[PDB]
Amino acid sequence: CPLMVKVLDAVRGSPAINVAVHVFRKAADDTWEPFASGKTSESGELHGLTTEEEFVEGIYKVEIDTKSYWKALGISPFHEHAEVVFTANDSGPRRYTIAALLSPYSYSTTAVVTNP
Amino acid sequence: CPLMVKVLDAVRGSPAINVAVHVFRKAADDTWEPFASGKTSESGELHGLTTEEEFVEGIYKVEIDTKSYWKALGISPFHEHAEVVFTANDSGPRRYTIAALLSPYSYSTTAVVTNP
Amino acid sequence: CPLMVKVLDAVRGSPAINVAVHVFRKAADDTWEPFASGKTSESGELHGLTTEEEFVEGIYKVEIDTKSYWKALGISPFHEHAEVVFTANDSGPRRYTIAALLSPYSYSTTAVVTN
Amino acid sequence: CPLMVKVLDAVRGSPAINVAVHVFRKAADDTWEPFASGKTSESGELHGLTTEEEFVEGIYKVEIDTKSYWKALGISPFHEHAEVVFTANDSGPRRYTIAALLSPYSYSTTAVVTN
Ligand SMILES: *S(=O)(=O)c1ccc(Br)c(-c2nnc(-c3cc(Cl)c(O)c(Cl)c3)o2)c1
Ligand SMILES: *S(=O)(=O)c1ccc(Br)c(-c2nnc(-c3cc(Cl)c(O)c(Cl)c3)o2)c1
Question: Do C10 and A108 lie within an 8 Å CB cutoff?
Fold first, then answer.
């Protein structure tokens, strides 16, 4: 439960289902290492990406594959993806929810950070 | 469960707790009649505003008392409130989630509409 | 011009053109009195709503007719309109830009208040 | 000018001034090559990044240094930066404005693409 991604569709007023999500972690050599990936469910949510053991301090990138999502609805969108880059767990473990609200030429993203 | 309001704080990265919410319904004489009210919980959510029986077709206004919320954090915000005005249930009963993401000089709002 | 309204379309990536905008001022009896109105230009902007003399401190509402905008594009929208309610304050900066970014089931709004 | 970046501050209701912005172009080997950079002006805008000749079709990334912006205001932010990745397309309108509205734990971004 340390990392959860929630994606909403501003055109339809619905969860954004079947959205691919790739998570990377910056390595010591400054490259982005693949960390976890998955797809949003029918609720627009992606659970089970990581564990509290594996989710150590670091800089993480959550790539939400918005272009692929829109094309499949018949919309040719602006962005390639929405990327969310953040330092995690640097004051000890936290739980992160990364949310995104998608439109064809815009998105909004926020984080809800809680201390267990 | 027909109407739920969720409020998030973009400054803190947290639910917006203890936010007053007033719901009105437009009457036949074109006035706004008080319909329901409540406060967001520690999760940022307000449940139990209405019932499927009472929540008939109509034009509804959800007033989120953002100014009061910000002042209590020591911030003098721009808006008096965030108002969300919509026609509900005009193709039969639906479930509505009204979400708002608040900043001192801005907000975003969306709806998730589902058919039970 | 102390008040300008800017409206953007998040579906097409464009200004929102020919959107009706109505401004109201709260009266002493708590009713909303018509104050100014117009339609957004080809740039998505509505200028010339008021003057410095007329735009006194008080509570104002800007109503943006989003439903009609979407209907004309053939897209079913959620909201009847977008509403922005705020207090004008003499102690703050003097020019108010109310911006709105529209989608069918969501909108975002901000204020840019400058000198 | 085919590309402009505009940055707004949702906490203060103002342009976001002196924000570093870096633009990259995706190379054939999938690396990001520096393309242009600058700092936002007192209006929150960054003009003059590129020319029509240089801004050929391809994938571009605009990185906005939000963390430094918030740190200078004393506010602890969530993101390292805001990122906007898009394809430039000759068949669409010719002028791209990338706008971002910043909060400490959230941002919104849009594109206004016009002729
Ligand atoms: S809650 O259960 O966590 C919950 C319930 C419903 C919703 Br719709 C949400 C939620 N999470 N994020 C957002 C959101 C993100 C952005 Cl970027 C935005 O602009 C808006 Cl208006 C909402 O809603 C949470
Ligand atoms: S116009 O000259 O282009 C113009 C004038 C004033 C403003 Br404030 C803007 C503008 N550009 N983008 C935005 C904006 C972006 C987002 Cl992501 C957002 O959520 C909102 Cl509410 C506004 O405003 C353009």
Answer: no
Nearest to C79 by CA among C104, C58, C55: C104
Number of domains in chain C: 1
Return the residue whose CA atom lies nearest to atom 4 of ligand 2: C6
φ/ψ region of B113 (left if φ > 0, alpha if ψ in -120 to 50, else beta) reads beta
Whole-angstrom distance, CA of residue B78 vs CA of residue B95 = 31
- Domain membership of residue D99 as a residue range: 1-115
* Binding pocket residue ranges, ligand 1, CB within 6 Å: A 6, 8, 99, 101, 108-110; B 6, 8, 97, 99-101, 108-110, 112; C 106; D 106
CB D15 within 8 A of CB D7: yes
Element (H, E) at B71: helix B66-71
> How many Cα atoms are found within 13 Å in the side-chain-facing hemisphere of B108?
30
Residues D47, B78: Cα–Cα separation, whole Å? 29
What's the token pair of residue D39?
A: 């700092």
DSSP string for D26-70: E-TTSPEEEEEEEE--TTSEE--S--TTT--SEEEEEEE-HHHHH
Subunits with at least 3 CB pairs below 8 A relative to chain D? A, B, C
Task: Write out the two tokens for D106.
Answer: 């959230």
D84/A79 CB distance under 8 A:
yes
Q: D87 CB contacts (<8 Å, ≥6 apart)?
A: A80, D57, D58, D59, D60
Closest ligand by atom to A16 CA: 1
Sign of CA dihedral A97, A98, A104, A105: positive
Residue C25 DSSP label:
E
Which of A8, A17, A43, A62 to mutate to test ligand 1, by most ligand atoms within 8 A of the CB atom? A8
**Domain CATH code at residue C58:** 2.60.40.180
C111 touches chain B (CB under 8 A): yes
CA–centroid distance, B10 to ligand 1, in Å, is: 11
Residue of D105, D70, C111, D69 lying closest to A109 (CA atoms): D105
Cited resolution, angstroms: 1.2
**C-alpha triplet B103, D12, A82: angle, nearest 5°:** 55
Q: In sequence order, what are the beta bridge partners of C60?
A: C25, C86
